[PDB]
């Protein structure tokens, strides 16, 4: 058994992550980091909307976990502010549960796209979405960092919702190390 129940073991000096979007209304989104559930049913901190876990890249410390309902309220503005306020050398993990698109506004999409999102622009009602971002450094090109799955009547795993999606990988811890010569 590997950290985050990974298919294969992570190489040494790497962070293990596993992101899971919600699957309809009964299967909840989950964010696993280094074998610890940051957001999920288990920690009682997952809800409808975009669920964000923020980790200090330098220390591996969880700095913030917060969800933003995109179906009720006006949480697009607060979400954009929350993202922009994250410190440099941070990892951001974003997963949808149920819906993350209904009231998703341009300012929030611009904040997520500025982090490297190629799919937030394509968000539609009830689309499942998972995303890994680095603030103040570049993630290695080979890790799976993003996935989207749109609601489609002919493919929907649940009556009214698309299938849940997952991403997993290993992030090297030494991308910003102060090296010798």
Q: How far apart are CA 173 and CA 34, in angstroms?
A: 12
Q: Taking the CB of residue 171, how many other CB atoms lie within 10 A of it?
A: 21
Q: How far apart are CA 30 and CA 67, in angstroms?
A: 12
CA 143 to chain centre: 14
Contact criterion met (CB below 8 Å) for 68 and 80: no
Q: How far apart are CA 144 and CA 23, in angstroms?
A: 20
CA dihedral over 64, 69, 75, 76, signed as positive or negative: positive
Domain locations in the chain?
A: 1-181
Q: Taking the CB of residue 106, how many other CB atoms lie within 10 A of it?
A: 11
Q: How far apart are CA 38 and CA 32, in angstroms?
A: 6
Which of 43, 40, 42 lies closest to 22 in space, CA to CA? 40
Q: How far apart are CA 144 and CA 153, in angstroms?
A: 27
Q: How far apart are CA 114 and CA 155, in angstroms?
A: 31
Measured in angstroms, the resolution is 2.3
């Amino acid at each position: 058994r590997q950290k985050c129940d990974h298919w294969s073991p992570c190489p040494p000096d790497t962070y293990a992550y596993r992101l899971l979007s919600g699957g309809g209304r009964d299967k909840y989104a989950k964010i696993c980091f280094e074998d610890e559930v940051l957001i999920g049913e288990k920690t009682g901190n997952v809800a409808r909307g975009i669920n964000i876990a923020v980790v200090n890249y330098e220390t591996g410390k969880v700095i913030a976990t917060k969800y933003f309902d995109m179906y009720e309220g006006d949480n697009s503005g607060p979400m954009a502010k929350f993202i922009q306020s994250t410190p440099s050398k941070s990892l951001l993990f974003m997963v949808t549960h149920d819906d993350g698109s209904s009231k998703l506004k341009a300012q929030a999409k611009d904040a997520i796209e500025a982090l490297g999102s190629k799919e937030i622009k394509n968000m539609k009602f009830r689309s499942s979405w998972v995303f890994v971002a680095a603030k103040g450094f570049e993630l290695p090109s080979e890790i799976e960092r993003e996935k989207i799955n749109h609601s489609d009547q002919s493919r929907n795993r649940y009556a009214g919702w698309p299938a849940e999606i997952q991403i997993e990988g290993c992030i090297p811890k030494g991308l910003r190390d102060y090296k010798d010569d």
